Amino acid sequence: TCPFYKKIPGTGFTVDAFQYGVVEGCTAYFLTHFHSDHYAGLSKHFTFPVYCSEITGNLLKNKLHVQEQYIHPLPLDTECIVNGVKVVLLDANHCPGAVMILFYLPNGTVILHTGDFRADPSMERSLLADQKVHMLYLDTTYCSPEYTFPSQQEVIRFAINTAFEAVTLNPHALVVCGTYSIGKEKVFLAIADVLGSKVGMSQEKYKTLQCLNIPEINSLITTDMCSSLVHLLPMMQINFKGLQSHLKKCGGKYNQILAFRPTGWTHSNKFTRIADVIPQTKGNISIYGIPYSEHSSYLEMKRFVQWLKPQKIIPTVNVGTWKSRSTMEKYFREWKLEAGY
Ligand code: NI
Secondary structure, three states: OOOHHHEEOOOOEEEOOOOOOOOOOOOEEEOOOOOHHHHOOOOOOOOOOEEEEHHHHHHHHHHOOOOHHHEEEEOOOOOEEEOOEEEEEEEOOOOOOOEEEEEEOOOOOEEEEOOOOOOOHHHHHOHHHHOOOOEEEEOOOOOOOOOOOOOHHHHHHHHHHHHHHHHHHOOOEEEEEEEOOOOOHHHHHHHHHHHOOOEEOOHHHHHHHHOOOOOOHHHHEEOOHHHOOEEEEEHHHOOHHHHHHHHHHOOOOOOEEEEEEEEOOOHHHOOOOHHHOOOEEEOOEEEEEEEOOOOOOHHHHHHHHHHHOOOEEEEOOOOOOHHHHHHHHHHHHHHHHHHOO
């Protein structure tokens, strides 16, 4: 049955709630982004209205075959009316097409649902600046002070410099990047751009990327693996066995692999700077784990919430254990006492 933290009070609405069958009292189903833990349950047999971004709607139609008459895309940063309730979609700084949703309830309550997000000070100048928010449905993925990670820009600098050095030293090295969902496209696009190459990938992944409105995409990606020296593979194949096998398939065009696994957080962050990251190596294969996150760090999350000053916080992540829930509630109280709201 649908959990309370996926239901928006005073409305007929649910958020990211497609795996529970027909939810009692639900007149419109919102989808924040196209990640499987959020879309789980949608298919061509769904016949209720789905409200989402343009990009998420492309993916619903093309990848899951949802029929067009039930997809309701909304423009961002624009006041819209849904079943008699004013809503606004905001950029979540997550993966392509990911949104936060502002609901203006008929009784005067304003609710922000962040979906999955990476808080940024640029959000402090969107339509959020213009009114008070009473209730916040918050992505608490990394809500503990041990979770620090560098900016996305530092991590991409590291990747570009590492790849450019390796290929200039050995023009017969292949770069491989792991993927299992949309998001983190900058990793493989930035590397291909510095090397003067397209990114090669499976037909299924190319289709997925063609749904994303990324400018000049036909210029950066391809299904012709032979012409590319940056290859995308499933995240599960980014290990010594999987990579040795791939290299066999390239027919002696290459004699070395440099591979990237963009993880979120790994405890190497508590001790080590990005500058100091080193690979695991076996023979002619090296594997770098890079801390490229599309979720808030602890400090980013804290700054957002202390700026917004909500009256009530509803966590949406790590809510299944009493120890996690108690930990989060203690941080929310600290934040409120330190800031004075
Ligand atoms: Ni997500």
